[PDB]
Write a protein that binds this ligand. Structure first.
Ligand SMILES: [Ca+2]
Ligand SMILES: [Ca+2]
Ligand SMILES: [Ca+2]
Ligand SMILES: [Ca+2]
Lengths: 165, 165
């Protein structure tokens, strides 16, 4: 709390053309990890295009952390099957939050992160001021799997009585 | 932190038929108070049916507190008029968070709170165990105003390092 910058709300929106790990479908869920914290979405049954629309909220004490993301196919009576992984840096978003831009029309773009051979972006990721909030939109190409993307949006939670940014 | 159970997420979903405090509309926002904490939603312009869909995140160190919700009309260059208020107890939700509900099927209704002459519920409020999460849905009829309801949902955020439930 003396350590707390704020909380990172990771809105896991949807999975797109995810890998088949049963016979003709999968039962996917997302897990994220940032340092010691691990959080998961619910399982969506028999859908390789799952609409999770679920928030995973992590505490942040460091500007330079990496979020790891993975998708699994839930099997009730066997080991869950792999559906791929990705990761992303929070530094750009946190740096943007620290630019202290006071509105700032709706839609202005503060930072753009380009897809690269090393990162997991399927398309450029924009940090934008939207509806009175700074957010980052992400489309993650999944690694170690034959197909699949996960769409997410980062939002920030400030807690009064904490270190802050 | 030594006292902190965790964080209560109050999602302020929407206002329904809120009072007109300008000429033909209002610019509503919600102020939520609990203990020493005071949080605010953004203003929605010229809409008496505002879709805030906004999360307000409160620290919980005392399970016995009341949450007060007050709606106001934003007037940029003048005073902000009251548009009614409601309150609710978080004790039932916290009580439920402390039960053994891992292993309950999704969709299990743990607690139902009925509207009464004393409380602000417009209809029965259910505390539901769903998709591995406990949620409370609330429809609050605003007091001290000619019309208006606010819809909200409680969810819980764990904080590693906290006292916990
Ligand atoms: Ca399988
Ligand atoms: Ca499966
Ligand atoms: Ca007014
Ligand atoms: Ca006004």
């Amino acid at each position: 709390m003396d350590d707390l910058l704020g909380l990172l709300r990771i809105r896991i929106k949807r999975g797109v053309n995810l890998a088949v790990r049963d016979i003709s479908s999968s039962d996917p869920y997302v897990v994220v990890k940032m340092g010691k914290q691990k959080l998961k979405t619910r399982v969506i049954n028999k859908d390789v295009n799952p609409e999770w629309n679920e928030d995973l909220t992590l505490s942040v004490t460091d500007s330079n952390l990496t979020v790891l993301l993975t998708v699994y196919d839930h099997d009730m009576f066997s080991k869950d099957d792999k559906m791929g992984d990705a990761e992303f840096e929070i530094k750009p978003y946190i740096e943007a939050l620290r630019m202290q831009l006071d509105g700032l029309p709706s839609g202005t773009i503060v930072t753009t992160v380009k897809p690269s051979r090393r990162n997991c972006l399927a398309e450029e990721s924009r940090v934008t001021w939207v509806d009175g909030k700074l957010v980052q939109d992400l489309v993650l190409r999944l690694r170690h799997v034959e197909c699949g993307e996960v769409e997410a949006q980062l939002q920030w939670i400030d807690l009064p009585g904490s270190k802050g940014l």
